[PDB]
Design an enzyme around this catalytic site. Structure first.
Site, PDB file in Angstrom:
ATOM      1  N   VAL A 162      -0.576   4.933  -6.661  1.00  0.00           N
ATOM      2  CA  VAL A 162       0.051   3.973  -7.559  1.00  0.00           C
ATOM      3  C   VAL A 162      -1.006   3.291  -8.389  1.00  0.00           C
ATOM      4  O   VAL A 162      -2.116   3.056  -7.919  1.00  0.00           O
ATOM      5  CB  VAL A 162       0.778   2.811  -6.834  1.00  0.00           C
ATOM      6  CG1 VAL A 162       2.042   2.451  -7.585  1.00  0.00           C
ATOM      7  CG2 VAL A 162       1.112   3.144  -5.426  1.00  0.00           C
ATOM      8  N   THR A 173       0.789  -1.215   0.000  1.00  0.00           N
ATOM      9  CA  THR A 173       0.000   0.000   0.000  1.00  0.00           C
ATOM     10  C   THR A 173       0.824   1.271   0.000  1.00  0.00           C
ATOM     11  O   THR A 173       0.252   2.357   0.015  1.00  0.00           O
ATOM     12  CB  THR A 173      -0.883   0.078   1.297  1.00  0.00           C
ATOM     13  OG1 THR A 173      -0.130  -0.371   2.433  1.00  0.00           O
ATOM     14  CG2 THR A 173      -2.142  -0.757   1.171  1.00  0.00           C
ATOM     15  N   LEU A 174       2.151   1.158   0.022  1.00  0.00           N
ATOM     16  CA  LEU A 174       3.008   2.296   0.429  1.00  0.00           C
ATOM     17  C   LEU A 174       2.583   3.664  -0.107  1.00  0.00           C
ATOM     18  O   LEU A 174       2.490   4.630   0.640  1.00  0.00           O
ATOM     19  CB  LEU A 174       4.488   2.015   0.146  1.00  0.00           C
ATOM     20  CG  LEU A 174       5.325   1.397   1.277  1.00  0.00           C
ATOM     21  CD1 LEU A 174       4.492   0.678   2.361  1.00  0.00           C
ATOM     22  CD2 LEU A 174       6.389   0.470   0.679  1.00  0.00           C
ATOM     23  N   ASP A 175       2.294   3.729  -1.399  1.00  0.00           N
ATOM     24  CA  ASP A 175       1.812   4.964  -2.011  1.00  0.00           C
ATOM     25  C   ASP A 175       0.338   4.783  -2.464  1.00  0.00           C
ATOM     26  O   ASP A 175      -0.055   3.715  -2.948  1.00  0.00           O
ATOM     27  CB  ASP A 175       2.793   5.422  -3.106  1.00  0.00           C
ATOM     28  CG  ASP A 175       4.282   5.037  -2.774  1.00  0.00           C
ATOM     29  OD1 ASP A 175       5.068   5.882  -2.241  1.00  0.00           O
ATOM     30  OD2 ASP A 175       4.657   3.854  -3.026  1.00  0.00           O
ATOM     31  N   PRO A 176      -0.507   5.799  -2.232  1.00  0.00           N
ATOM     32  CA  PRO A 176      -1.946   5.567  -2.432  1.00  0.00           C
ATOM     33  C   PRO A 176      -2.439   5.822  -3.856  1.00  0.00           C
ATOM     34  O   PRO A 176      -3.542   5.382  -4.204  1.00  0.00           O
ATOM     35  CB  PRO A 176      -2.609   6.553  -1.448  1.00  0.00           C
ATOM     36  CG  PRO A 176      -1.445   7.387  -0.843  1.00  0.00           C
ATOM     37  CD  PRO A 176      -0.239   7.143  -1.695  1.00  0.00           C
TER      38      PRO A 176
END
Lengths: 48, 357, 92, 327
Positions: free
Chosen positions: B81, B76-79
């Site tokens: 992506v 999930t690190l970047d929303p």
């Protein structure tokens, strides 16, 4: 969005910023279309 | 010739044999030949996440569409992506922990805040930030070390002030920090303009990546015509995520113990892969090619060939249900036989089965 | 008032109002750890720490009325020796 | 209606469990952890134990132990399991042999690693607990879980160790400390022991009355070892849960407190007394008390027939003759 691609000879994506490459291929958006959970066009899209 | 067989069953005769004597318990099915409810329940969709609704909302949509007990996902690190999101269904959720600590690859567009006096500088600062990096989470945020294994500048446009590059990295690495860092290393400042994830663990955008529109259609098609072929193509069986691992096939009789977490012992060993080193991460499989568990190997292939006794593998992660392979003696329903002992006398005065002969 | 001080950073270049430094210590700064010149005056505080394990860099958030552009290459920067962690506390 | 029904140590905790089910807690077996009183927890457990118990699995395990060959027995494990002695039991037994007064408490010096655990991992606080009798019985229950886990696994923990322990323990998988129903015979310690057995015949990998009984004998030994030996086991149990990124939750609501409480308020006389109490109850038991309601159908809904575990072995051994005879 800015990310574009063309499929290379090997079948895999080649990424680029350009809307048309150096060799004159028009490029595709790298990202999929938005999805709306209520989309009654499932039947129309499936026959093709 | 067995190198045509699906998934974990590819190259089955290229496994060094141990035992010849055994009998195949009727329970379970092979991964490809699974049936719908349980195929879906060992399911995994390589999704092309759209650049928008958060990874959790999207997985929720997949849940509402498919209707299933649990769904989890690879990262999930970047929303914002787009790209590989591996959505796991039901039993497959067992494998999300690993999928989340799995290596991920990206294609990133960086926005520099001013034109570089030397275009070649970006490629160099990008080259500068490889291997073990320092990185603090963006906007609870502690400094950690993450590795960037390789990167590569694909294209740079100094006038537009945008660069597009590829990075391969350890799970937990933040691309939006990476972009800020090039920014600082170049003086002009920077930030992440957009991001696409090109591989999550054993799955890239090349390996059968389907869209939310496909998921909706596949489900619509069953719900209205009862054909499965669609639904069964967008959903890949969890065994997919395990092709990379070396293999030990387990005796049918010994399968259930592994499902409870027990060591695998020599008596339970059936076949083994060549070049398995002590301590490797291996997958343990039924003869039908089902993933029982992921395990830590404890015996080298050379040891596994000559050894009389000994433990072969410890269980790292149970995948398979607990009583999928129970070891039924095949007597006959005990309770049901007591109903017929009321129906014919032979039961004692107190109503309990007679110790008689 | 500060006490015993260590060499921390060597000025690399400015960046949107911040001071970027090449590292000259073997240790790793605390976040917000105050930064000093040789004449022991607080020029600001540690903001971002970055770079590879071998070649660390960090940024200094400039204190009230301190221009980022009023420095040059070479100019050293300093830190309280108590505000430093060894590199060992981040490795496996 | 409104308020949650608290649970865990001294009924102080709530919410924690409910949340954990979304996070992969598959030890919890309560359908509604936050809105279920103590009595209803019993009702729910007893009924769920019945649905869980598998007689065909039970008989298979028995027949293998008694009648299976050298090969089938070594795959199963039961004979080796029954020969095994957990590290903690073994150091009690060693003290026993050497001691000329087997009736005293056993002197324990906690290891360096154990001193560290007690400083770091447990709550520092006084414990005003008026009702301590359900806490001892929880100890009795949890020790059975632990001893069973040590046997079945032959001394080495595994990634399902916490699951095995949590299953065999009614205070964990059902947050149930009452154990005995009340509505409108037997000691509470006798029920705890019967519960341990019934769960040990329904849940784990090895479902075997002798095993369950062996595990219980070993519980009595640790108890006889005294408070300090009980603490040593409690510490191991605690770690196995803490080290798990899902089941750590049972330390939070129960074992965190229980071990800290026991260390300070735990009585040596109450321990010894519990030991002699539980031994009597165990020795008064036989296969005749281990009853399960099992299923036969009916069409004119499923009809339950009650039979104890000994009845199941006779029907097995009876039908086993017809198989040995006819062909």
């Amino acid at each position: 969005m800015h990310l574009m691609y063309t499929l290379g000879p090997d079948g895999k994506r080649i990424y680029t910023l350009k809307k048309v490459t150096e060799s004159g291929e028009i490029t595709k958006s790298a990202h999929p279309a938005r999805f709306s959970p209520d989309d009654k066009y499932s039947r129309q899209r499936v026959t093709l | 010739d067995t190198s045509e067989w699906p998934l974990l069953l590819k190259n089955f005769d290229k496994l060094l044999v141990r035992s010849g004597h055994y009998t195949p318990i009727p329970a379970g099915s092979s991964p490809l030949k699974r049936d719908l409810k349980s195929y879906i329940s060992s399911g995994v969709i390589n999704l092309d996440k759209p650049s928008n609704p958060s990874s959790h909302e999207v997985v929720a949509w997949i849940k509402r569409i498919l209707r299933c007990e649990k769904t989890g996902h690879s990262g999930t690190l970047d929303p914002k992506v787009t790209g590989c999101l591996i959505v796991c269904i039901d039993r497959a959720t067992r494998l999300v922990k690993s999928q989340q600590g799995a290596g991920k690859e990206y294609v990133c567009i960086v926005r520099l805040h001013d034109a570089l006096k030397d275009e070649k500088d970006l490629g160099r600062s990008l080259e500068n930030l490889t291997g073990a990096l320092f990185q603090r989470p963006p906007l609870k945020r502690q400094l950690r070390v993450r590795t960037i294994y390789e990167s590569n500048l694909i294209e740079f446009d100094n006038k537009r002030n945008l660069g597009v590059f590829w990075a391969s990295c350890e799970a937990g690495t933040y691309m939006r920090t990476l972009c800020v860092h090039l920014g600082m290393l170049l003086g002009v400042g920077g930030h992440m303009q957009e991001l696409r994830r090109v591989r999550s663990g054993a799955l890239s955008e090349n390996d059968n990546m389907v869209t939310l529109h496909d998921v909706m259609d596949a489900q619509w098609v069953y719900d209205n015509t009862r054909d499965e072929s669609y639904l069964r193509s967008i959903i890949q069986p969890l065994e997919t995520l395990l092709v990379g691992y070396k293999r030990i096939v387990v005796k049918d009789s010994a399968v259930n113990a592994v499902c409870y977490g027990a060591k695998l012992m020599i008596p339970g060993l059936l076949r083994y892969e060549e070049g398995i080193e002590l301590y490797d991460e291996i997958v343990l499989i039924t003869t039908k090619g089902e993933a029982i568990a992921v395990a830590i190997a404890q015996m080298s292939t050379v040891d596994l060939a000559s050894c009389d006794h000994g433990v072969v593998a410890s269980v790292k992660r149970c995948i398979m249900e607990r009583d999928l392979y129970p070891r039924r003696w095949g007597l006959g329903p005990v309770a049901q036989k007591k109903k017929q002992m009321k129906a014919d006398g032979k039961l004692d005065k107190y109503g309990r089965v007679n110790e008689n002969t | 008032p500060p006490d015993t001080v260590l060499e921390m950073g060597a000025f690399l270049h400015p960046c949107e109002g911040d001071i970027v430094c090449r590292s000259i210590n073997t240790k790793i700064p605390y976040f917000n750890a105050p930064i000093y010149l040789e004449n022991k005056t607080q020029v600001g505080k540690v903001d971002e720490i970055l770079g590879p394990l071998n070649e660390v860099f960090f940024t200094i958030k400039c204190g009230d009325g301190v221009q980022a552009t009023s420095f040059k290459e070479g100019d050293k920067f300093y830190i309280a020796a108590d505000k430093l962690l060894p590199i060992e506390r981040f490795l496996p | 209606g409104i308020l949650k029904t608290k649970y865990g140590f001294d009924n102080l905790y709530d919410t924690v469990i409910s949340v954990s089910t979304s996070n992969g807690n598959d030890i919890n077996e309560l359908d509604d952890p936050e809105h279920t009183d103590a009595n209803d927890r019993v009702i729910e457990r007893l009924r769920k134990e019945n649905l869980k118990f598998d007689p065909e699995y039970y008989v298979s395990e028995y027949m293998t132990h008694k009648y299976g060959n050298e090969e089938d027995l070594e795959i199963n494990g039961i004979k080796e399991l029954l020969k095994f002695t957990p590290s903690i039991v073994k150091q009690y037994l060693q003290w026993y042999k050497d001691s000329t007064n087997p009736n005293l408490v056993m002197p324990i010096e906690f290891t360096d690693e154990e001193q560290k655990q007690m400083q770091d991992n447990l709550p520092k606080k006084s414990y005003l607990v008026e009702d301590i009798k359900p806490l001892y019985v929880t100890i009795l229950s949890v020790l059975f879980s632990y001893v069973f886990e040590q046997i079945e696994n032959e001394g080495t923990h595994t990634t399902e160790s916490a699951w095995t322990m949590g299953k065999l323990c009614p205070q964990i998988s059902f947050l149930d400390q009452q154990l005995k129903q009340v509505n409108e015979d037997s000691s509470l310690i006798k029920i705890a022991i019967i519960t341990g057995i019934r769960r040990a015949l329904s849940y784990p990998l090895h479902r075997n009355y002798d095993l369950a009984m062996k595990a219980w004998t070993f519980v009595y030994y640790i108890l006889r070892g005294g408070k300090r030996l009980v603490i040593r086991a409690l510490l191991d149990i605690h770690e196995t849960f803490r080290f798990h990124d899902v089941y750590y939750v049972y330390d939070k609501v129960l074992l965190d407190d229980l071990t800290a409480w026991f260390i300070s308020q735990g009585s040596e006389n109450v321990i010894r007394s519990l030991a002699l109490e539980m031994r009597k109850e165990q020795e008064s038991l036989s296969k005749q008390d281990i009853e399960f309601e099992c299923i036969a159908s009916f069409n004119e809904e499923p009809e339950w027939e009650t039979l104890n575990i000994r009845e199941m072995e006779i029907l097995a051994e009876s039908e086993y003759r017809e198989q040995q005879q006819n062909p």
